[PDB]
Each structure stands twice: as structure tokens, then as C-alpha cells.
């Protein structure tokens, strides 16, 4: 089997992307954030405290296929400070036409304020390795891990758009969605993520520096977080750019024509256009814009988030020894 679903930016800045997900019988359609940096599928629900709901909710008592997982609970927190917790059902879940039975659906009793405030996101669908799932006493498998027995190839691909719709595919590689060839590189699962080592970088039309960059491919992170020395080398080529303590990163004049940024995948090169690195005005009408490349020092790991991934066609190869592929597009 395969699935193919359209993923759409939630707002004018590409802060996150939502993808429809059908849960239960009859299907209840919720818009979820597909996240290669976590491993829980959780939703707003009829159990969620009423004052914390503003979203479409899952009602397990209206789904004939829902089963309570007796004794199971979950509790999760994320790098941006958000969190949620609750109890666990198994139910039928479909993405882009691909159906999994017995998927753990984590029903929120409570959600944090950032989730209440974001009317566009009805929950998360995690796509990292299942060792990161938060259900106790026994951890639950991701939608991808449950799908692998049935998929045509144990792979999924991410094709995110720049201020435009894009696609998540499960089980196949669309050879019309990219240019040149895919180059694959080794993955380490020792921390539960799609973790790999880039071979180096170049800024604009300058020289490629061979320096190993260990990082994670994360569709649920907005920006590109890289080592401080690398990020400094980039913004040195933007004459108005400066680090802003109060705003929380590099800012620059919206009128600038930004240089591209190139990263290494083995001997191959992925070029991020300068326009993608303009994240947008700090407020509507401002003359100052927020940078899309920021230092990873405060997070403690490098993160190839949406700014990087939306410049590439990205293959998440979930074979027993996993690998990660990138192509230009």
C-alpha cells in the first residue's frame, strides 16, 4: 500500500504545516502537525478540559472502533515549551488513503496554552523512532512503524512548499518530484531521531568547507539551527544583519537580497535559496525581518528544520538499518 496527503502552511510565514488525518469510525477529520522529531500521535478530544479547547476534537464515544488501552497513560513535552497528557485509545487511523488499524491515539485530558491558542492545529502525528514514545507502562508504535508491514517500501518522503502546498508520501519515491539523483547518508538511532552527519557547507558563491555537522531532520521545527561558527559565516555576507537579544536571533532589513546557503550530503550539495532564509517581518509592516538560519547552541543539537527541508525532496528510509536521502528540486 501507499498514501499521499497534501500538507499546507498554517499561516503566511510557513510556521508549521498541517496534514489531514482521519480517526475512528465514522472518520473524524482532524488537521495534525506531522513531526519527524517526536513519536506520539495525540489529539484534542471530548475529554479535553473545556476551557482549554478553542480546534476540531476527537470524540472516542462516537467511534465504534475505539478501544480503551486499560491502565495506559501518556505525558509529553517539546523543545518550544508546549505539553499535553491523557489516556490512550487504539483506533483506526488513515493518512492520504493509507489505513492502519490498532494505532495508539493518545486522547488529551489537558493541553498547554500554545496548543489552545493555535486554532489551526488539532494535534500531532510523530514520525521519529518508537523508542521516543511516551505511553506507560508499555510504549506504543508510530503510525509509520505500524504501516511498514503493509507498505510497498519501508519509506516516507517529505516535500514541503515555500509559501505553497506540498506533499507527504508513504511507501514510494515520486521520481517527478525532484531533479538530479538522491544521495543517501548513514543514520544513527542511538537518540531515537533521524540523526545524520552533513559533510560541510558553503555561503552564497563562496568555498565549501569540509566540517562534519551532526544533526536531526525535523519537520516539526520551523527554522534551520546550525553551529554558531557556521551561522556567523552566513550572516557575515548580509550587510544589515545582526543578532538581536530582545527578538531572540539574527534579524536583517526586509529589503535585502539574501545569499543562498549550501549543505553537504556525502559528495552531493543542497542549495537553500536566499528568499527561503527570509522568515518574514517581525510584525506586520515592520522594516525588519527574522532570519531563517539561527544558532543551535541553546538547543544543544543541530536541527535541519523546515527552512532546510523545504529546499529538498527528503527520503526517510526506515529499513532495519535506516538511512536518509536528499535530492534537489
Amino acid at each position: 500500500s501507499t498514501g499521499s496527503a497534501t500538507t499546507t502552511p498554517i499561516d503566511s510565514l510557513d510556521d508549521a504545516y498541517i496534514t489531514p488525518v482521519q480517526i475512528g469510525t465514522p472518520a473524524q477529520t482532524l488537521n495534525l502537525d506531522f513531526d519527524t522529531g517526536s513519536s506520539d500521535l495525540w489529539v484534542f478530544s471530548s475529554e479535553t478540559t473545556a476551557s482549554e479547547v478553542x480546534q476540531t476534537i476527537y470524540t472516542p464515544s462516537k467511534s465504534t472502533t475505539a478501544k480503551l488501552l486499560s491502565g495506559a497513560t501518556w505525558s509529553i513535552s517539546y523543545g518550544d515549551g508546549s505539553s499535553s497528557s491523557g489516556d490512550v485509545y487504539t483506533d483506526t487511523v488513515s493518512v492520504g488513503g493509507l489505513t492502519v488499524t490498532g494505532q495508539a491515539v493518545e486522547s488529551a485530558k489537558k493541553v498547554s496554552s500554545s496548543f489552545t491558542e493555535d486554532s489551526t492545529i488539532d494535534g500531532l502525528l510523530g514520525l521519529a523512532f518508537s523508542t521516543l514514545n511516551t505511553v506507560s507502562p508499555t510504549q506504543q508504535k508510530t503510525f509509520f512503524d505500524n504501516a511498514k508491514a503493509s507498505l510497498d517500501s519501508p519509506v516516507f518522503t517529505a516535500d514541503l512548499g515555500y509559501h505553497a502546498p506540498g506533499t507527504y508520501n508513504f511507501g514510494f519515491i515520486d521520481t517527478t518530484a525532484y531533479t538530479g539523483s538522491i544521495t543517501y547518508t548513514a543514520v544513527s538511532t542511538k537518540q531515537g531521531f533521524w540523526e545524520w552527519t552533513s559533510t560541510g557547507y558553503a555561503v552564497g558563491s563562496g568555498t565549501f568547507k569540509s566540517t562534519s555537522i551532526d544533526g536531526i531532520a525535523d519537520t516539526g521545527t520551523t527554522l534551520l539551527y546550525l553551529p554558531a561558527t557556521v551561522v556567523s559565516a552566513y550572516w557575515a555576507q548580509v550587510s544589515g544583519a545582526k543578532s538581536s537579544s530582545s527578538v531572540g536571533g539574527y534579524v536583517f532589513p526586509c529589503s535585502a537580497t539574501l545569499p543562498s546557503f549550501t549543505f553537504g550530503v556525502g559528495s552531493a550539495r543542497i542549495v537553500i535559496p536566499g528568499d527561503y532564509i527570509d522568515f518574514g517581518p517581525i510584525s506586520t509592516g515592520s522594516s525588519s525581518c527574522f532570519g531563517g538560519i539561527q544558532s543551535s547552541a541553546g538547543i544543544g543539537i543541530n536541527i535541519f528544520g523546515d527552512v532546510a527541508l523545504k529546499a529538498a525532496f527528503v527520503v526517510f528510509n526506515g529499513a532495519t538499518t535506516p538511512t536518509l536521502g536528499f535530492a534537489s528540486k
Binding site: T36, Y78, G79, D80, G126, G220, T221, I299, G305
Partner: peptide, 6 residues
């Protein structure tokens, strides 16, 4: 901006 698990 978003940053998805700890």
C-alpha cells in the same frame, strides 16, 4: 516558531 520532543 515551533520546535517539536524532550
Amino acid at each position: 516558531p515551533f520546535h517539536x520532543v524532550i
